[PDB]
Design a protein around this nucleic acid. Structure first.
Lengths: 62, 44, 102, 76, 65, 49, 87
RNA sequence: GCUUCGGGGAGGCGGCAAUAUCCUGUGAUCCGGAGAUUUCUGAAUGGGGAAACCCACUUACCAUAAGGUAGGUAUCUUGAAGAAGCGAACGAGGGGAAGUGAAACAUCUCAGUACCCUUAGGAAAAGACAUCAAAUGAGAUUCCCCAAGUAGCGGCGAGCGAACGGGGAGAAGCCGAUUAAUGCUAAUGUAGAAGAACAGCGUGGGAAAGCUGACCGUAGUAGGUGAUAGUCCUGUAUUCGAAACAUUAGCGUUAACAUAUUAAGUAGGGCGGGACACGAGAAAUCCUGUCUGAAGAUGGGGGGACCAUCCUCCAAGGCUAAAUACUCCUGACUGACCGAUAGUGAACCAGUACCGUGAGGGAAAGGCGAAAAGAACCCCUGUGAGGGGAG
C-alpha cells in the first residue's frame, strides 16, 4: 500500500488524509457503540494516517 | 492539642517548592542530590 | 531453529522415542509434534468460552534437540546442514546423503 | 570588590601570631583609595579605585598607558 | 599451560623473522611476518599480550621491512 | 622450538601439551605423567641451570 | 477541520444520559480534555447535519483509583460534555 | 509507534499474562545504519508562577467571527557568533576546621586533611635552566626503585622528614607543537554466514551415566537438553560479509585566533606573614599586604648567615608530546570472591513500602514440576474456606 500512497501527488494526498480522518472518527464512534465487528481496521487505519502524514511531510520538505 | 503538624498547601509549596529550590543555588544542590540518589519525589 | 513447520520429524528421546510425526508448530526452543508426547488435559467447562471442555488428549511441547528430522530414503534420523548453490538460493540439506530434500 | 584594577592586588590571607605563637587567620587588605585622575587625551577626570602602588604606576607610566592597559584587560 | 604453549608458538616465528632480517631477503621476511601477524592479533584478544605491545611490534617490524 | 602445526595438533588432545625449553614450569613438569624432550633442549637446560 | 474530528471521542451511555436524552433530547459526548465549548459546538454541528446547538456544557472528572495485583493505578482523566439540540 | 537502507527466512503483534481481532514467502516479528514525528514541566529563554499552570505582544497567511496554521519576542559577552544548565573520579586554583596524639595542654600534631567555592582536558600541572654539582662535572618537565627513616627540623617532647646522587619509564625542544569544519586514502566499530564427527544392548519416569564397539579433532574440561554428552541443540577452532553512519590515522584545503625579540615599579631592601623536611633559628632560597627601590653585559642571579676567589646561568615574553592520576561508562576476559541474615541498601515492580515539615533515614521479600501435564468429574460445606475420592 505504501507504494500506492507514494505514487500519488501531494494535493490529492491532503484530501485523502481528510477522508481518512473522517473514517477514523466514524470507526471510533462505532467502536464506542460496539457496532464495529472487527478491531483490526482501526489499527490499520491509524497506521495509514501516519504513513500519509509522513509522505506529505517529505513532499513538502522536498 | 494543636499538634506539631498543621497542613497548608500554600505555605508548603512556598517553603519546599521546586521553584523556591531553583531560586537558591544551594537548593539546586539538594535537588541534584535527590536525583543522584534516585528518589522519585524530588519535591512536595 | 533449523527445523521448520510442515516437515516430518522423528523423536529419539523420551517415552515416545521411535515415533514419527509431523511438526505442528515451533516457538523459540520448544517444538510441538502431532501424535507424540501426548499429555492428558483437564479443562473446566466455561459457558463464556465456546469450547465444550472436559478431558482432552492433546500434544505437549517438547525440547527441539530431542526431535530430529527423518530422512525419507533411509528412514533414519539425520542431522541438517545448509548448502549454498551458485544461484544463491538457500535450501536445507541432509547431512548423510547430501540429499536435496529438506 | 576590594581589588586594585591596575595591578590586580586583592586581599591576602595570613596569620596573626601572638607572643606565645598562637595563630589566628587574618587578612591583609590593599591600600585602596578613590582618586580622580586628570586625563588630557580625553580632557576629563576618570575616577579609579586604585592602590598606592597603582598611583605610583600612574606616576611612572602615565594615565594614558594605564588606561589603555585597563581597556585591554576589560572593564572600562 | 595452554596459554604458555600459545605464547611459545609465536616466539619461534619471530625468531625466524629475525633470521630473515639478518639474511636481508625481502620475500623470506615478508612471508614469515605475514604468517605471524594473525596469530599475534588473535593472542591480543585473549589479553595474554598487551595490545599496545602488539601494535609497537607491528610498527617496528613494518619499519624493519 | 614450537611449530604452529605441532601446536595445533597438540592443543586439542586432552593431556598433551607442548612448551618451549626456555618457558618451562615445574608445576607442568611434575603434573604431566610422562615427558618427551629433545637432546638439544636438554643441552640448553644444562646451559640454563 | 481536522481538529473538529478529534474533538469528540464518542457517546456516553448511562441511565442519567438515557433519561436526559429522552426527557430533553440532549446528547452526551466524551471530548478531548483541552477542547473548549466552542470547539465542541462546531464539532457537533459538523459531524451531525441538520442539528443546531443551543448551549454547550463541559465538565472534568478525575479518574478513579483502582488496585489490581501488587500495583496501585489511577484511571486516565476524561472530559464529557452535554449538548442541547433543536427540537 | 512511521519512512528509508542493509541482514534474516517462518513465524509474529513488549513482560506480569493470557484472550480476541489479525499480520506474515507481495518477506512479517526481530537486529544494525540513517531519517521523520517528538505534548507539557525542567537552564526554560515572550511576562508571571505554588514545576508539569496563568496571561500575553507581534509578523505572515487563512476564517468571519469570538478562531486556526507557521514563525519571532529572556539575560550576558564579543563583535551576526557564542555562553547559561546537567553529570562519576582524576587535575589546577581561591578559602580552610575540629575530634585526636603529646598519656593534661597553649607551641606542635591532626593537616593544608574533611568541607565550601571557581574552573578545564582526556588528562591536567610542570617543562628547557638567571637548575644543580664541586665528581673525570651533568644538562628541561613528569612518574617508579634506592639513597633513607639517613642529613636535618622539633615545648629537641609527641612527632615531622629531605636533598645530592645512582638505576629505570619516556624522551624534544621551539616562537603556529592552536582551534574548528569540509574533501580524499587506509583501517576499525555499529546487524550477520558457514562451521566436523554415535550407534547397539541393559537399567531407568527420562540416558548424557554403565557394557560393547565406532567417528571428528586448527573444534576435548563452554551453556542447555527429563541423571554426568567432543559426535542431540546453541555453540568452539577456522574462514568471513557492510547499503548507511561513527571513530582513528595520513594527505590536501579552508576560516577563526596567535605570531615576543630579550624584558622596571622589575631584582633587591625595611615591617608583618606564608611555603620551603627547616617551628626565627647563625637561616640561605621562593610568594607578597605596606613602604621603598637598582644595575641593566665594564652588568646581574645562585652556589644554605656573611666576605673574597672560583664555577654555573641570563629573571622581569609565550608555547611544547611521552612516560603519570581516575572510572558515570563500552567490548573481551578473569577470580583458592559471595551465594538470599551473604553479595550493592536493592537477585523480587528498591532508593520502593515505611518514617520526617524538611534536609534526610531506610527495609522485608528468591526456588512446584523436566514439561502445567496447575487436579475434568463426584462428595461434605454457605456456589465460602478447607478437605476426601478420581485423575
Amino acid at each position: 500500500k505504501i507504494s500506492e500512497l507514494r505514487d500519488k501527488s501531494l494535493e490529492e494526498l491532503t484530501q485523502l488524509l481528510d477522508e481518512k480522518q473522517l473514517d477514523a472518527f466514524r470507526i471510533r464512534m462505532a467502536k464506542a457503540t460496539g457496532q464495529l465487528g472487527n478491531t483490526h481496521e482501526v489499527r490499520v487505519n491509524r497506521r495509514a494516517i501516519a504513513q500519509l502524514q509522513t509522505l506529505i511531510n517529505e513532499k513538502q520538505r522536498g | 492539642m494543636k499538634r506539631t503538624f498543621q497542613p497548608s498547601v500554600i505555605k508548603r509549596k512556598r517553603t519546599h517548592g521546586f521553584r523556591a529550590r531553583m531560586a537558591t543555588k544551594k537548593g539546586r544542590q539538594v535537588l541534584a542530590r535527590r536525583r543522584a540518589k534516585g528518589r522519585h519525589r524530588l519535591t512536595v | 531453529s533449523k527445523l521448520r513447520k510442515g516437515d516430518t520429524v522423528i523423536v529419539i528421546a523420551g517415552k515416545d522415542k521411535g515415533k514419527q510425526g509431523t511438526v505442528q508448530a515451533v516457538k523459540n526452543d520448544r517444538i510441538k509434534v502431532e501424535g507424540i508426547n501426548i499429555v492428558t488435559k483437564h479443562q473446566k467447562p466455561n459457558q463464556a468460552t465456546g469450547v465444550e471442555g472436559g478431558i482432552l488428549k492433546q500434544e505437549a511441547f517438547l525440547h527441539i534437540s530431542n526431535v530430529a528430522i527423518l530422512n525419507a530414503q533411509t528412514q533414519k534420523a539425520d542431522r541438517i546442514t545448509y548448502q549454498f548453490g551458485e544461484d544463491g538460493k538457500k535450501q536445507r540439506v541432509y547431512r548423510s546423503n547430501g540429499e536435496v530434500v529438506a | 570588590s576590594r581589588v586594585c584594577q591596575v595591578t590586580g592586588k586583592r586581599p591576602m590571607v595570613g596569620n596573626n601570631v601572638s607572643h606565645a605563637n598562637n595563630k589566628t587567620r587574618r587578612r591583609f587588605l590593599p591600600n585602596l583609595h578613590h582618586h580622580r585622575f586628570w586625563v588630557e587625551s580625553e580632557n576629563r577626570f576618570v575616577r579609579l579605585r586604585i592602590s598606592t602602588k597603582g598611583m605610583r604606576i600612574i606616576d611612572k607610566l602615565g594615565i594614558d598607558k594605564v588606561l589603555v592597559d585597563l581597556r585591554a584587560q576589560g572593564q572600562k | 599451560q595452554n596459554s604458555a604453549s600459545q605464547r611459545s608458538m609465536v616466539r619461534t616465528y619471530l625468531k625466524r623473522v629475525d633470521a630473515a632480517i639478518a639474511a636481508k631477503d625481502y620475500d623470506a621476511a615478508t612471508e614469515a611476518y605475514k604468517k605471524a601477524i594473525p596469530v599475534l592479533d588473535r593472542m591480543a584478544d585473549k589479553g595474554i599480550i598487551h595490545k599496545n605491545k602488539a601494535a609497537r611490534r607491528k610498527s617496528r617490524l613494518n619499519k624493519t621491512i | 622450538e614450537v611449530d604452529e602445526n605441532l601446536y595445533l595438533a597438540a592443543r586439542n588432545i586432552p593431556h598433551v601439551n607442548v612448551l618451549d625449553t626456555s618457558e618451562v614450569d615445574p608445576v607442568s613438569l611434575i603434573a604431566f605423567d610422562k615427558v618427551i624432550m629433545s637432546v638439544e633442549a636438554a643441552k640448553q637446560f644444562e646451559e640454563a641451570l | 477541520n481536522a481538529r473538529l474530528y478529534q474533538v469528540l471521542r464518542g457517546p456516553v451511555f448511562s441511565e442519567k444520559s438515557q433519561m436526559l436524552g429522552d426527557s430533553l433530547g440532549v446528547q452526551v459526548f466524551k471530548i478531548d480534555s483541552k477542547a473548549t465549548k466552542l470547539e465542541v459546538k462546531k464539532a457537533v454541528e459538523l459531524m451531525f447535519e441538520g442539528v443546531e446547538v443551543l448551549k454547550v456544557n463541559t465538565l472534568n472528572v478525575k479518574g478513579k483509583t483502582k488496585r489490581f495485583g501488587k500495583n496501585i493505578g489511577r484511571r486516565n482523566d476524561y472530559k464529557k460534555a452535554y449538548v442541547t439540540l433543536k427540537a
